[PDB]
UniProtKB/Swiss-Prot annotation, chain A:
Component of the plastid division machinery required for PDV1 localization to constriction sites. Involved in chloroplast division site placement. Required for the proper formation of FtsZ rings at the division site in nongreen plastids (e.g. etioplasts). Inhibits FtsZ assembly, functioning as an antagonistic regulator of FtsZ dynamics against ARC6, by recruiting ARC3 to the middle of the plastid to facilitate its interaction with FtsZ proteins. Required during stromule biogenesis in the leaf epidermis, especially in non-mesophyll cells plastids. Residues 96-116 form a coiled coil. The gene is CDP1. This is Plastid division protein CDP1, chloroplastic. Disruption phenotype: Defects of chloroplast and FtsZ filament morphology (e.g. long FtsZ filaments formed by multiple rings or spirals); elongated chloroplasts with multiple division sites. Aberrant stromule biogenesis in the leaf epidermis associated with giant and pleomorphic amoeboid chloroplasts, typically having one or more constrictions as well as one or more extremely long stromules. Reduced number of enlarged etioplasts in cotyledons associated with the formation of multiple FtsZ-rings. Exclusively expressed in young green tissues such as young cotyledons, shoot apex, emerging leaves and budding inflorescence. It is found in: Plastid, Chloroplast inner membrane. Self-interacts. Interacts (via N-terminus) with ARC3 (via MORN domains). Binds (via N-terminus) to FTSZ2 proteins, FTSZ2-1 and FTSZ2-2. Recruited ARC3 to the middle of the plastid where subsequent complex made of CDP1/PARC6, ARC3 and FtsZ proteins can form; this complex enhances the dynamics of Z rings during chloroplast division. Interacts (via C-terminus) with PDV1 (via C-terminus). Interacts with MIND1. Residues 1-151 are chloroplast intermembrane. Signal peptide: none annotated.
Curated annotation (Swiss-Prot), chain B:
Signal peptide: none annotated. It comes from the Eukaryota. It comes from Arabidopsis thaliana. The chain holds residues 641 to 818 of 819 of the full protein. Component of the plastid division machinery required for PDV1 localization to constriction sites. Involved in chloroplast division site placement. Required for the proper formation of FtsZ rings at the division site in nongreen plastids (e.g. etioplasts). Inhibits FtsZ assembly, functioning as an antagonistic regulator of FtsZ dynamics against ARC6, by recruiting ARC3 to the middle of the plastid to facilitate its interaction with FtsZ proteins. Required during stromule biogenesis in the leaf epidermis, especially in non-mesophyll cells plastids. This is Plastid division protein CDP1, chloroplastic. Self-interacts. Interacts (via N-terminus) with ARC3 (via MORN domains). Binds (via N-terminus) to FTSZ2 proteins, FTSZ2-1 and FTSZ2-2. Recruited ARC3 to the middle of the plastid where subsequent complex made of CDP1/PARC6, ARC3 and FtsZ proteins can form; this complex enhances the dynamics of Z rings during chloroplast division. Interacts (via C-terminus) with PDV1 (via C-terminus). Interacts with MIND1. The gene is CDP1.
Length: 151, 152
């Protein structure tokens, strides 16, 4: 149900109310960090633990599952982030207590699914607009908890 | 002098860290195998020895050197091969005893140089026509020896 992960599961099957603006540079650093963690969790060293550094809630559970099954089937992706543009970022307090944030980003990425039985790799490419929900943790760090693809 | 794409990879590493036709599908397999070994030798697992399995002569020496350098700097690349077309391939006799082949291919790839130090990764994207010269070894299979990027 989180954004984009259905495409990668399919690929794995057929192959192998106070609003405040958020700093655009910071919002971009969070996404970039996430993208690079996704690449490594899904990559040949299968760094699954790192997912829990940048993710929480449904994001974590779902991306953790797909990473583990891939490590189980001895497949991995090579991921390249072609383009990243942060469209909007806003912090807010829902029911006060802890803060939440939202980030709309424009992403362009490519990937190869590598299965050793098969010398021809499956290929993935996409450009998309995505909306992220984040929650500031007790440590004061942001983690992505939900994601939604847009039109 | 330099083989294939080597120069560009070194710079982004520096800044941001008589004659018979060959069956085209044989040629397609051989380029895909090499492009796979390159991504694994230059990737996070740093499989340098594996270069010796598909490469020889100047290819092997130059690509091995690049892969050992990236590892020495604790940087790695993620490569994605986006499009591959063999335009032409053929075998020819080389020397008193030896066999060689030429493969001409259109390639499109993308790559990301990963450095733990900075959040942004340098991003490489290219489309090119390349020419490979391979040499059949004492065993059965071919190995890439030289490669020239002719267009873009
Ligand atoms: Mg995502
Ligand atoms: Mg090449």
């Amino acid at each position: 149900i989180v954004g984009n992960i259905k495409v990668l599961i399919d690929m794995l099957k057929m192959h192998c109310l106070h609003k405040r603006p958020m700093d655009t540079e910071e919002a971009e650093e969070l996404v970039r960090q996430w993208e690079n963690v996704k690449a490594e969790a899904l990559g040949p060293t299968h760094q699954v633990y790192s997912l829990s550094e940048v993710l929480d809630e449904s994001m974590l559970v779902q991306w953790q599952t797909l990473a583990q099954t891939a490590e189980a089937k001895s497949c991995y992706w090579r991921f390249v982030l072609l383009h990243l543009e942060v469209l909007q970022a806003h912090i807010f307090e829902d029911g006060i207590a802890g803060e939440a944030a939202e980030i709309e980003a424009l992403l362009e990425e490519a990937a190869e699914l590598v299965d050793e039985s098969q010398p021809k790799n499956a290929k993935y490419y996409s450009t998309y607009k995505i909306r992220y929900i984040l929650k500031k943790q007790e440590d004061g760090l942001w983690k992505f908890c939900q994601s939604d693809i847009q039109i």
